């Protein structure tokens, strides 16, 4: 987050938490009361064969 | 021995400069409240 | 036309001309920087076989800005000169020197070299039984030969930057850049 | 965005390349700006319905 003067005063780490998802899905640092849908899970390959 | 890192170690990750918006950035950086050792 | 005030040359004569060459396991490096050679005296079709450009075209090299130039030294056999650029597979490009799939620069050509290797380089990495390459990546620093003229304000001019052209109108800034800091962007991400 | 091109500024695809293989390159940027305002246009004419 930049300001008037182009300096950085926030930042918001994107896999920290669920909250923290939400925030850079909506490209805000407050979020509205709502169900957003922020990414996918699968689970992978345990090995070869 | 161990601490606590709260919102610490971002930089700038380039020279162009950018007023009043969100931009993003994929770079490498510190994690938040990760543990970082401490020495005496 | 705006490119900064810097008037020495670049040293071309002396990758081009030192007689001590390197090998291809081990080759030789250096970096170029600060100075405002020419590229078309290597246009004056000298002892140059092959002269083979990847990102941009030789007639044009005349008036771009590089930031740096690695320069590369060694020998080829001689009829392998065509494994020498992307995407190519052999002795050479496998075990020996390899080019990136995504590379931009020139290439100029007119004694033990590694035959057992246990696994395939990475681009630009560094039993044995017995060219020059120039890359750069688009500050100015090292800025072909152009000469600059006068700054003026306030009616749409073309203008030429360091390389970067456009078009529009200049007036003065308000906006405090910190001293680090050269280009300027939007929400949009424009100039 | 590129599209498949070296650069998504088209003035250092013309500062860069020589005319037999800058048109290659600058096909790949008129294809995808045509299909995005393509899409803009046809989303704008089930709005205004
Ligand atoms: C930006 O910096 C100037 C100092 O030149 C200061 O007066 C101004 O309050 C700063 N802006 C903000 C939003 O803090």
Redesign the pocket.
Known sequence: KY???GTITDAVDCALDPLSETKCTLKSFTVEKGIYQTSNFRVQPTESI | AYTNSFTRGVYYPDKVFRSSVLHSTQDLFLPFFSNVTWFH | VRFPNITNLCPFGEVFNATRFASVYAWNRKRISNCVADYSVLYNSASFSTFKCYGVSPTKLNDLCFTNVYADSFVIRGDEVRQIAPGQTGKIADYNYKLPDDFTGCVIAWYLYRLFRKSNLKPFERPLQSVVVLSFELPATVCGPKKSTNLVKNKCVNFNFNGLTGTGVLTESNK?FLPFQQFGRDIADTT | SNFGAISSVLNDILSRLDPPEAEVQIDRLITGRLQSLQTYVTQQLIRAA
């Open positions: 300001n008037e003067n | 405090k």
